[PDB]
Amino acid sequence: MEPDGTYEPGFVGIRFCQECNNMLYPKEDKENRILLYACRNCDYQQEADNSCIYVNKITHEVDELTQIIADVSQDPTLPRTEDHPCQKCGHKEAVFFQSHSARAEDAMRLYYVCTAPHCGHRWTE
Amino acid sequence: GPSSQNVTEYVVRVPKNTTKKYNIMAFNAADKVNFATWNQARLERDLSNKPEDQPWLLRVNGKSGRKFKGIKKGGVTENTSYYIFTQCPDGAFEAFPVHNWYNFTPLARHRTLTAEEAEEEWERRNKVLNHFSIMQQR
Amino acid sequence: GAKKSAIGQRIVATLPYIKQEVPIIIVFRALGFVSDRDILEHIIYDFEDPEMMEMVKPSLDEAFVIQEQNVALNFIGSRGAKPGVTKEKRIKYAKEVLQKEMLPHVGVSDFCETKKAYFLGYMVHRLLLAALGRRELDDRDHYGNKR
Amino acid sequence: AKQDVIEVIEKAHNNELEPTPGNTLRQTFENQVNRILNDARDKTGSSAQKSLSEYNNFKSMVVSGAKGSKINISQVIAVVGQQNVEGKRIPFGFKHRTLPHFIKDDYGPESRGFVENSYLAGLTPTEFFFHAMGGREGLIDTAVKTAETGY
Amino acid sequence: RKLRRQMDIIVSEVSMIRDIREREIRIYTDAGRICRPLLIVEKQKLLLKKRHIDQLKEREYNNYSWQDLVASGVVEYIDTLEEETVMLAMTPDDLQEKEVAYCSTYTHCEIHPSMILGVCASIIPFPDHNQSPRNTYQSAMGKQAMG
Amino acid sequence: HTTLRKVTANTAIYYDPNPQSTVVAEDQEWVNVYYEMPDFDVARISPWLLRVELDRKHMTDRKLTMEQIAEKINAGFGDDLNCIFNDDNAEKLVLRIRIMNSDENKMQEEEEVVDKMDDDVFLRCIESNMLTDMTLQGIEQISKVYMHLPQT
Ligand SMILES: [Zn+2]
Ligand SMILES: [Zn+2]
């Protein structure tokens, strides 16, 4: 129970209706005081899994963890840096680039993708 | 055994002319269809609302059973062919031509919201203000 | 009003010879893919990201008034053509428009009606990417985009 | 000046840099590199002004106040200086680049605008083209401004 | 690409581009795209060798031609969309000296940099020692002269 | 013009109808902090829970207090918006919001003229209004810039 830490509960949209294959919405059981998920277009109902139904913003999932596929390492127009050691593989020749995209996180922070095998590992400095 | 080392070799036959047309019936894996739980099925061309071009209607078991829609693929192949390789009691392989490729997809046993009434009108009024009750008034 | 606080995701579609804007979801209904999971599969083949799933959701919410291909066709017919209480012809004419007029480069017949569904869906995907902003906004005058 | 820019890029990539108040990090980075390349330009121009002999015909036209200015002498003798469109440095018209000749993400002064050479030494091919972008702004503005003031 | 160098698909025609960060492959064969010839470089060095030059000198009495040169696959045609994704050396000199000078990933090289000029701009000698709009007035006036 | 939207790191909506056994066991002592807060009509207030997280850095610049924000929102919306807040003794700052109803009249007479949209869905409209319209120290409409200058 501390100010410091993190919170990534893994949001959930789909677990769509199994009976007609359509989207599920939260709904109340006032008798059991429990969340349920129902398809709007049929009588099908099923109990929930988590008390969370919706979240908004995150002040920074910086989201460096994904999107950037390892294959980006092949692009000839991207710079090869002699800065060494893929923290994982015992090999230098990292490919790097800044940020990209438009929310580009005003950050200028380099993102590094090793190009050697024995990893395919992504990291920032 | 096959888990260690094995070799098999079977002749492949093609009959000059099949006694029947061979077709493909494809389902979405997401529908997780199990024929183990099918006991009866009917399969007929939907045709009344207007034959060999017309879509398929798949009706499983009784009237209360699941109904599916079968849609014809434009052509079996555009520059190749698809063939079925089958095991025969002699121990050979037998190969059969594909005549058609059909896509089969699920339909609801009873849903039907219908827009013919004034749902379109309700949309004019739609301020996301209701959802359950309209489904009840039906 | 108190609709859901932020209409900034209500994705509509213009179509050729249509007098009125329609939401993209109707067109998918008109292609026959009633299954919301299937439309979601055409729109974004990576349902693993919660943020994309939330971005489409109010557009799904709009879809409820129409829930079958024929009526959806009757919607596009009446929203697009001159008035005609014939209903069924409005559906057939609109059926032929979707067949002939929309994305004609992807095809001109029934036998390639599925192929059009992915491509229309790809545009919504191509659009959602920009709307997340992880995708650059495309220049007006890049020469690669000239003929 | 060029080595000092690389120092500012390294400070930015290291994320050691912090924004100036009232602005974003890119704007600060851009404000800082622009301050360096202009200051470089003016220091070197002032050097060129200092070296002119008194017999020189070129110095006599500017000093009399017949035609052209001190800045023209700078460009002819020392360095053409920064190129720019709509105020800012040459935009990444390609994917994160200015010309295919450069590597992606090269804010260094040459790949993005600034020409080292003087009109006497000649402009390198890239330097040449970026200069034409800066010259076009001047041609277009003449035509557009002419119509609007007229009205 | 190997097929293109070998001409199983038409050089001047097919443009072929990969957008790695998006996992797309676009290929273009429609009319109307602007493209230019470039030298191929390979393994950090030029693929064209002086022996091809000796055949070009030989053309004064032989059937060898620019088309043969394209058939060696030592030059390629690049449209503006594809030109975005290449790493392009300015001149053989620079591609040679390189060690840790800049990069070593080049894929094309310029057959001569002064080729960026159009027809009238080429009459004007030392165009790079001139102020840029000065060159534009000459391109109009040169076209204006008589003779 | 600072809107709550500028200050906010994130928002979340939970179904937590039992504060005494809240969906975030770590949040549980703050519920212990609030039981004297209208304990009679906790059977009457709604079971939907709104939870907000705030940026410490925005909160420092605007030099605000959590009680200033809580008093701002309660004052802005009205008595319906039942607010409680986390302890100041943390680097993080979070605010927990429930909605109170009209109590006595909700006995389902004719059909309860609301057309029975879910209360959560009403909560998202609350959060929408809450982000965009709330103007803590945002005394006007001057977009959101303000640049201070020293002149010599
Ligand atoms: Zn359902
Ligand atoms: Zn590595």
PDB file of N, CA, C and O in Angstrom, chain E residues 81-131:
ATOM      1  N   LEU E  81       7.822   7.674 -55.032  1.00  0.00           N
ATOM      2  CA  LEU E  81       7.361   6.945 -53.863  1.00  0.00           C
ATOM      3  C   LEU E  81       8.412   5.980 -53.349  1.00  0.00           C
ATOM      4  O   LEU E  81       8.663   5.925 -52.142  1.00  0.00           O
ATOM      5  N   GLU E  82       9.015   5.229 -54.264  1.00  0.00           N
ATOM      6  CA  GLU E  82      10.113   4.343 -53.932  1.00  0.00           C
ATOM      7  C   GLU E  82      11.401   5.069 -53.485  1.00  0.00           C
ATOM      8  O   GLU E  82      12.127   4.542 -52.632  1.00  0.00           O
ATOM      9  N   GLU E  83      11.659   6.273 -54.034  1.00  0.00           N
ATOM     10  CA  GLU E  83      12.864   7.085 -53.729  1.00  0.00           C
ATOM     11  C   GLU E  83      12.932   7.524 -52.283  1.00  0.00           C
ATOM     12  O   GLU E  83      13.979   7.930 -51.800  1.00  0.00           O
ATOM     13  N   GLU E  84      11.799   7.473 -51.608  1.00  0.00           N
ATOM     14  CA  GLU E  84      11.718   7.730 -50.187  1.00  0.00           C
ATOM     15  C   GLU E  84      12.400   6.689 -49.321  1.00  0.00           C
ATOM     16  O   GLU E  84      12.849   6.998 -48.222  1.00  0.00           O
ATOM     17  N   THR E  85      12.478   5.457 -49.801  1.00  0.00           N
ATOM     18  CA  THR E  85      12.961   4.377 -48.940  1.00  0.00           C
ATOM     19  C   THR E  85      14.384   3.897 -49.245  1.00  0.00           C
ATOM     20  O   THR E  85      14.861   2.965 -48.609  1.00  0.00           O
ATOM     21  N   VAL E  86      15.036   4.511 -50.234  1.00  0.00           N
ATOM     22  CA  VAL E  86      16.415   4.183 -50.597  1.00  0.00           C
ATOM     23  C   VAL E  86      17.438   5.035 -49.842  1.00  0.00           C
ATOM     24  O   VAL E  86      17.147   6.155 -49.449  1.00  0.00           O
ATOM     25  N   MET E  87      18.632   4.497 -49.625  1.00  0.00           N
ATOM     26  CA  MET E  87      19.735   5.277 -49.064  1.00  0.00           C
ATOM     27  C   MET E  87      20.752   5.588 -50.114  1.00  0.00           C
ATOM     28  O   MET E  87      21.562   4.749 -50.484  1.00  0.00           O
ATOM     29  N   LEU E  88      20.722   6.835 -50.545  1.00  0.00           N
ATOM     30  CA  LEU E  88      21.266   7.264 -51.819  1.00  0.00           C
ATOM     31  C   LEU E  88      22.524   8.133 -51.782  1.00  0.00           C
ATOM     32  O   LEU E  88      22.422   9.313 -51.501  1.00  0.00           O
ATOM     33  N   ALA E  89      23.686   7.564 -52.109  1.00  0.00           N
ATOM     34  CA  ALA E  89      24.976   8.282 -52.131  1.00  0.00           C
ATOM     35  C   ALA E  89      25.072   9.335 -53.224  1.00  0.00           C
ATOM     36  O   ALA E  89      24.639   9.113 -54.343  1.00  0.00           O
ATOM     37  N   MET E  90      25.689  10.467 -52.916  1.00  0.00           N
ATOM     38  CA  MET E  90      25.693  11.586 -53.842  1.00  0.00           C
ATOM     39  C   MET E  90      26.598  11.344 -55.032  1.00  0.00           C
ATOM     40  O   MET E  90      26.299  11.767 -56.150  1.00  0.00           O
ATOM     41  N   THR E  91      27.705  10.652 -54.792  1.00  0.00           N
ATOM     42  CA  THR E  91      28.743  10.535 -55.806  1.00  0.00           C
ATOM     43  C   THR E  91      29.752   9.442 -55.400  1.00  0.00           C
ATOM     44  O   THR E  91      30.056   9.298 -54.213  1.00  0.00           O
ATOM     45  N   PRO E  92      30.281   8.680 -56.387  1.00  0.00           N
ATOM     46  CA  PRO E  92      31.140   7.505 -56.165  1.00  0.00           C
ATOM     47  C   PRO E  92      32.233   7.805 -55.172  1.00  0.00           C
ATOM     48  O   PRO E  92      32.679   6.922 -54.456  1.00  0.00           O
ATOM     49  N   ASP E  93      32.721   9.033 -55.225  1.00  0.00           N
ATOM     50  CA  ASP E  93      33.766   9.518 -54.341  1.00  0.00           C
ATOM     51  C   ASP E  93      33.413   9.323 -52.865  1.00  0.00           C
ATOM     52  O   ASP E  93      34.198   8.764 -52.092  1.00  0.00           O
ATOM     53  N   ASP E  94      32.224   9.790 -52.488  1.00  0.00           N
ATOM     54  CA  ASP E  94      31.745   9.722 -51.105  1.00  0.00           C
ATOM     55  C   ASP E  94      31.460   8.285 -50.624  1.00  0.00           C
ATOM     56  O   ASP E  94      31.746   7.909 -49.481  1.00  0.00           O
ATOM     57  N   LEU E  95      30.901   7.485 -51.512  1.00  0.00           N
ATOM     58  CA  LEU E  95      30.609   6.091 -51.238  1.00  0.00           C
ATOM     59  C   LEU E  95      31.892   5.283 -51.057  1.00  0.00           C
ATOM     60  O   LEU E  95      31.905   4.257 -50.396  1.00  0.00           O
ATOM     61  N   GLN E  96      32.975   5.763 -51.661  1.00  0.00           N
ATOM     62  CA  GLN E  96      34.302   5.162 -51.505  1.00  0.00           C
ATOM     63  C   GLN E  96      35.073   5.484 -50.228  1.00  0.00           C
ATOM     64  O   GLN E  96      35.506   4.570 -49.521  1.00  0.00           O
ATOM     65  N   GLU E  97      35.251   6.767 -49.937  1.00  0.00           N
ATOM     66  CA  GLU E  97      36.060   7.171 -48.787  1.00  0.00           C
ATOM     67  C   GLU E  97      35.495   6.611 -47.478  1.00  0.00           C
ATOM     68  O   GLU E  97      36.244   6.325 -46.532  1.00  0.00           O
ATOM     69  N   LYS E  98      34.174   6.433 -47.455  1.00  0.00           N
ATOM     70  CA  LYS E  98      33.438   6.087 -46.239  1.00  0.00           C
ATOM     71  C   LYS E  98      34.031   4.910 -45.453  1.00  0.00           C
ATOM     72  O   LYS E  98      34.417   3.878 -46.015  1.00  0.00           O
ATOM     73  N   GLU E  99      34.119   5.107 -44.140  1.00  0.00           N
ATOM     74  CA  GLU E  99      34.549   4.072 -43.208  1.00  0.00           C
ATOM     75  C   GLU E  99      33.750   4.170 -41.911  1.00  0.00           C
ATOM     76  O   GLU E  99      33.103   3.212 -41.474  1.00  0.00           O
ATOM     77  N   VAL E 100      33.821   5.356 -41.307  1.00  0.00           N
ATOM     78  CA  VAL E 100      33.022   5.735 -40.147  1.00  0.00           C
ATOM     79  C   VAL E 100      32.592   7.186 -40.351  1.00  0.00           C
ATOM     80  O   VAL E 100      32.225   7.888 -39.407  1.00  0.00           O
ATOM     81  N   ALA E 101      32.648   7.616 -41.609  1.00  0.00           N
ATOM     82  CA  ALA E 101      32.367   8.998 -41.976  1.00  0.00           C
ATOM     83  C   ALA E 101      30.883   9.357 -41.856  1.00  0.00           C
ATOM     84  O   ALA E 101      30.548  10.474 -41.467  1.00  0.00           O
ATOM     85  N   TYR E 102      29.996   8.415 -42.178  1.00  0.00           N
ATOM     86  CA  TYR E 102      28.557   8.706 -42.149  1.00  0.00           C
ATOM     87  C   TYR E 102      27.684   7.457 -42.030  1.00  0.00           C
ATOM     88  O   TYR E 102      27.091   7.207 -40.982  1.00  0.00           O
ATOM     89  N   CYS E 103      27.607   6.667 -43.089  1.00  0.00           N
ATOM     90  CA  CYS E 103      26.945   5.374 -42.979  1.00  0.00           C
ATOM     91  C   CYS E 103      27.471   4.478 -44.082  1.00  0.00           C
ATOM     92  O   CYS E 103      28.256   4.930 -44.916  1.00  0.00           O
ATOM     93  N   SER E 104      27.038   3.221 -44.114  1.00  0.00           N
ATOM     94  CA  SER E 104      27.528   2.320 -45.151  1.00  0.00           C
ATOM     95  C   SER E 104      26.425   1.487 -45.786  1.00  0.00           C
ATOM     96  O   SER E 104      26.691   0.515 -46.496  1.00  0.00           O
ATOM     97  N   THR E 105      25.188   1.896 -45.537  1.00  0.00           N
ATOM     98  CA  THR E 105      24.006   1.161 -45.971  1.00  0.00           C
ATOM     99  C   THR E 105      23.423   1.557 -47.344  1.00  0.00           C
ATOM    100  O   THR E 105      22.355   1.065 -47.706  1.00  0.00           O
ATOM    101  N   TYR E 106      24.114   2.419 -48.100  1.00  0.00           N
ATOM    102  CA  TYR E 106      23.632   2.930 -49.396  1.00  0.00           C
ATOM    103  C   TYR E 106      23.074   1.861 -50.287  1.00  0.00           C
ATOM    104  O   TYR E 106      23.485   0.721 -50.202  1.00  0.00           O
ATOM    105  N   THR E 107      22.115   2.207 -51.131  1.00  0.00           N
ATOM    106  CA  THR E 107      21.593   1.217 -52.071  1.00  0.00           C
ATOM    107  C   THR E 107      21.588   1.712 -53.517  1.00  0.00           C
ATOM    108  O   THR E 107      21.575   0.922 -54.461  1.00  0.00           O
ATOM    109  N   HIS E 108      21.603   3.023 -53.680  1.00  0.00           N
ATOM    110  CA  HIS E 108      21.711   3.615 -54.990  1.00  0.00           C
ATOM    111  C   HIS E 108      22.691   4.725 -55.023  1.00  0.00           C
ATOM    112  O   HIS E 108      23.065   5.265 -54.013  1.00  0.00           O
ATOM    113  N   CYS E 109      23.107   5.071 -56.218  1.00  0.00           N
ATOM    114  CA  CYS E 109      23.945   6.213 -56.368  1.00  0.00           C
ATOM    115  C   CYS E 109      23.601   7.032 -57.608  1.00  0.00           C
ATOM    116  O   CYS E 109      23.079   6.520 -58.603  1.00  0.00           O
ATOM    117  N   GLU E 110      23.840   8.332 -57.494  1.00  0.00           N
ATOM    118  CA  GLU E 110      23.524   9.313 -58.520  1.00  0.00           C
ATOM    119  C   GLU E 110      24.414   9.253 -59.764  1.00  0.00           C
ATOM    120  O   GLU E 110      25.621   9.445 -59.633  1.00  0.00           O
ATOM    121  N   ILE E 111      23.849   9.063 -60.962  1.00  0.00           N
ATOM    122  CA  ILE E 111      24.663   9.010 -62.199  1.00  0.00           C
ATOM    123  C   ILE E 111      25.360  10.324 -62.549  1.00  0.00           C
ATOM    124  O   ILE E 111      26.369  10.319 -63.253  1.00  0.00           O
ATOM    125  N   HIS E 112      24.777  11.435 -62.104  1.00  0.00           N
ATOM    126  CA  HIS E 112      25.474  12.721 -61.954  1.00  0.00           C
ATOM    127  C   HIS E 112      24.536  13.765 -61.343  1.00  0.00           C
ATOM    128  O   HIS E 112      23.416  13.964 -61.834  1.00  0.00           O
ATOM    129  N   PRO E 113      24.993  14.439 -60.273  1.00  0.00           N
ATOM    130  CA  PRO E 113      24.112  15.291 -59.458  1.00  0.00           C
ATOM    131  C   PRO E 113      23.534  16.516 -60.189  1.00  0.00           C
ATOM    132  O   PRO E 113      22.430  16.932 -59.875  1.00  0.00           O
ATOM    133  N   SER E 114      24.253  17.058 -61.160  1.00  0.00           N
ATOM    134  CA  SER E 114      23.807  18.198 -61.938  1.00  0.00           C
ATOM    135  C   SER E 114      22.610  17.829 -62.811  1.00  0.00           C
ATOM    136  O   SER E 114      22.109  18.666 -63.533  1.00  0.00           O
ATOM    137  N   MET E 115      22.248  16.549 -62.863  1.00  0.00           N
ATOM    138  CA  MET E 115      21.047  16.103 -63.592  1.00  0.00           C
ATOM    139  C   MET E 115      19.748  16.526 -62.998  1.00  0.00           C
ATOM    140  O   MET E 115      18.707  16.366 -63.611  1.00  0.00           O
ATOM    141  N   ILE E 116      19.773  17.025 -61.788  1.00  0.00           N
ATOM    142  CA  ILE E 116      18.533  17.501 -61.242  1.00  0.00           C
ATOM    143  C   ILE E 116      17.999  18.701 -61.995  1.00  0.00           C
ATOM    144  O   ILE E 116      16.847  19.053 -61.799  1.00  0.00           O
ATOM    145  N   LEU E 117      18.786  19.316 -62.874  1.00  0.00           N
ATOM    146  CA  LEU E 117      18.264  20.461 -63.624  1.00  0.00           C
ATOM    147  C   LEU E 117      17.407  20.078 -64.854  1.00  0.00           C
ATOM    148  O   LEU E 117      17.610  19.029 -65.453  1.00  0.00           O
ATOM    149  N   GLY E 118      16.441  20.934 -65.204  1.00  0.00           N
ATOM    150  CA  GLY E 118      15.544  20.735 -66.339  1.00  0.00           C
ATOM    151  C   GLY E 118      16.180  21.290 -67.586  1.00  0.00           C
ATOM    152  O   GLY E 118      17.330  21.647 -67.539  1.00  0.00           O
ATOM    153  N   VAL E 119      15.474  21.367 -68.703  1.00  0.00           N
ATOM    154  CA  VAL E 119      16.185  21.661 -69.953  1.00  0.00           C
ATOM    155  C   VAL E 119      16.821  23.053 -69.967  1.00  0.00           C
ATOM    156  O   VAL E 119      18.012  23.163 -70.261  1.00  0.00           O
ATOM    157  N   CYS E 120      16.061  24.102 -69.648  1.00  0.00           N
ATOM    158  CA  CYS E 120      16.600  25.466 -69.768  1.00  0.00           C
ATOM    159  C   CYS E 120      17.606  25.818 -68.708  1.00  0.00           C
ATOM    160  O   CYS E 120      18.531  26.551 -68.964  1.00  0.00           O
ATOM    161  N   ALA E 121      17.419  25.319 -67.513  1.00  0.00           N
ATOM    162  CA  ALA E 121      18.388  25.541 -66.472  1.00  0.00           C
ATOM    163  C   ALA E 121      19.743  24.958 -66.830  1.00  0.00           C
ATOM    164  O   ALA E 121      20.726  25.376 -66.271  1.00  0.00           O
ATOM    165  N   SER E 122      19.851  23.997 -67.743  1.00  0.00           N
ATOM    166  CA  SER E 122      21.203  23.496 -67.984  1.00  0.00           C
ATOM    167  C   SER E 122      22.107  24.381 -68.827  1.00  0.00           C
ATOM    168  O   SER E 122      23.323  24.215 -68.763  1.00  0.00           O
ATOM    169  N   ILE E 123      21.542  25.379 -69.515  1.00  0.00           N
ATOM    170  CA  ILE E 123      22.313  26.306 -70.355  1.00  0.00           C
ATOM    171  C   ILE E 123      23.147  27.213 -69.496  1.00  0.00           C
ATOM    172  O   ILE E 123      24.237  27.629 -69.875  1.00  0.00           O
ATOM    173  N   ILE E 124      22.600  27.532 -68.330  1.00  0.00           N
ATOM    174  CA  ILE E 124      23.232  28.477 -67.419  1.00  0.00           C
ATOM    175  C   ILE E 124      24.417  27.870 -66.620  1.00  0.00           C
ATOM    176  O   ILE E 124      24.232  26.960 -65.809  1.00  0.00           O
ATOM    177  N   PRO E 125      25.641  28.382 -66.875  1.00  0.00           N
ATOM    178  CA  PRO E 125      26.928  27.839 -66.436  1.00  0.00           C
ATOM    179  C   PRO E 125      27.265  28.291 -65.030  1.00  0.00           C
ATOM    180  O   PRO E 125      27.085  29.469 -64.757  1.00  0.00           O
ATOM    181  N   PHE E 126      27.816  27.417 -64.184  1.00  0.00           N
ATOM    182  CA  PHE E 126      27.962  27.667 -62.718  1.00  0.00           C
ATOM    183  C   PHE E 126      26.704  28.038 -61.930  1.00  0.00           C
ATOM    184  O   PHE E 126      26.823  28.780 -60.958  1.00  0.00           O
ATOM    185  N   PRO E 127      25.534  27.474 -62.286  1.00  0.00           N
ATOM    186  CA  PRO E 127      24.269  27.857 -61.674  1.00  0.00           C
ATOM    187  C   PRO E 127      24.344  27.837 -60.155  1.00  0.00           C
ATOM    188  O   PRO E 127      23.508  28.441 -59.493  1.00  0.00           O
ATOM    189  N   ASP E 128      25.180  26.988 -59.594  1.00  0.00           N
ATOM    190  CA  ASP E 128      25.349  26.990 -58.159  1.00  0.00           C
ATOM    191  C   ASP E 128      26.173  28.187 -57.590  1.00  0.00           C
ATOM    192  O   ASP E 128      26.129  28.403 -56.401  1.00  0.00           O
ATOM    193  N   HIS E 129      26.909  28.972 -58.374  1.00  0.00           N
ATOM    194  CA  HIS E 129      27.463  30.207 -57.785  1.00  0.00           C
ATOM    195  C   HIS E 129      26.503  31.411 -57.805  1.00  0.00           C
ATOM    196  O   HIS E 129      26.896  32.512 -57.455  1.00  0.00           O
ATOM    197  N   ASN E 130      25.261  31.206 -58.237  1.00  0.00           N
ATOM    198  CA  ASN E 130      24.241  32.249 -58.357  1.00  0.00           C
ATOM    199  C   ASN E 130      23.248  32.141 -57.273  1.00  0.00           C
ATOM    200  O   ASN E 130      22.936  31.036 -56.838  1.00  0.00           O
ATOM    201  N   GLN E 131      22.696  33.275 -56.879  1.00  0.00           N
ATOM    202  CA  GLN E 131      21.541  33.296 -55.989  1.00  0.00           C
ATOM    203  C   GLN E 131      20.300  32.603 -56.627  1.00  0.00           C
ATOM    204  O   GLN E 131      19.922  32.963 -57.732  1.00  0.00           O
TER     205      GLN E 131
END
